[PDB]
Design a protein around this ligand. Structure first.
Ligand SMILES: C[C@]12CCC(=O)C[C@@H]1CC[C@@H]1[C@@H]2CC[C@]2(C)[C@@H](O)CC[C@@H]12
Lengths: 249, 8
């Protein structure tokens, strides 16, 4: 019995609305303020999701908060890509049921280039024929893909946990394939996909940080948790104190 | 802090 998968499927977060007023014009202020609220809302689900993951509670409470604070961007973008793929077939960015981005909004949000990259990520799910099980194991692995260069409180258990989630992904690939070249080819493709998430998350990190600094001048509201994490944790990533863990060099 | 309350 696939205990691990049972857990991942059982704890997968449901639908989250942004609360966007689709009646008012597509302004930068409105679009970004709603994206910020969506983030605040999804942050709640990411925390509950993570705490329910196999072995996560073995991490020191401070490390638990740390990995979530550093990896949320990538986690949310990856799940959004999956939603877009399965809903609008990756043709539009399905941030939330009430906040779907078309080309016009991509331009209005002033993050069109970033949206293009997210669309590409979304299309990869289709191009690679990623299964729901692969998606779930890969997403779980993204939580363990960014840490401080100086290490975590109990780095050793984080290392064991990360290793186990890699083992589970490899297992999911092999649990559906007999050929070694196929398994090896698939593992290569998926680790490459995971790596591609980081550059995108990085651009969004830089973008949201800059936006926070002058949010008062462009009329963009940042919720409490988002504001705290973006001014305290994000700068640690942008300054090089916290770095992603890539599979490939 | 809603964040700490989220873990607490
Ligand atoms: C993570 C979110 C919100 C959750 C999601 O579906 C992915 C999406 C990616 C862009 C983020 C957005 C949250 C708010 C941010 C960080 C804006 O400030 C600029 C980039 C936005």
């Amino acid at each position: 019995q696939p205990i691990f998968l049972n857990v991942l499927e059982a704890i997968e977060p449901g639908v989250v609305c942004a609360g966007h007023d689709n009646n008012q014009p597509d302004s930068f202020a409105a679009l970004l303020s709603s994206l910020n609220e969506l983030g605040e809302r999804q942050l709640v689900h990411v925390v509950k999701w993570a705490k329910a993951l196999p072995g996560f509670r073995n991490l020191h409470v401070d490390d638990q908060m740390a990995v979530i604070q550093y990896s949320w961007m990538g986690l949310m973008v990856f799940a959004m890509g999956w939603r877009s793929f399965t809903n609008v077939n990756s043709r539009m960015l399905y941030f939330a049921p009430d906040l779907v981005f078309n080309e016009y909004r991509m331009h209005k949000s002033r993050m069109y280039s970033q949206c293009v990259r997210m669309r590409h990520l979304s299309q990869e799910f289709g191009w690679l024929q990623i299964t729901p099980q692969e998606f779930l194991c890969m997403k779980a692995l993204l939580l363990f893909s960014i840490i401080p260069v100086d290490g975590l409180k109990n780095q050793k258990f984080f290392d064991e946990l990360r290793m186990n989630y890699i083992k589970e992904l490899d297992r999911i690939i092999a649990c559906k394939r007999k050929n070694p070249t196929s398994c090896s080819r698939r593992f290569y493709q998926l680790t490459k996909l995971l790596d591609s998430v980081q550059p995108i998350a990085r651009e969004l990190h830089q973008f949201t940080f800059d936006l926070l600094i002058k949010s008062h001048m462009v009329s963009v509201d940042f919720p409490e948790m988002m504001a705290e994490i973006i001014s305290v944790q994000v700068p640690k990533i942008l300054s090089g104190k916290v770095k992603p863990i890539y599979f490939h060099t | 802090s809603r964040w700490q309350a989220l873990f607490d």
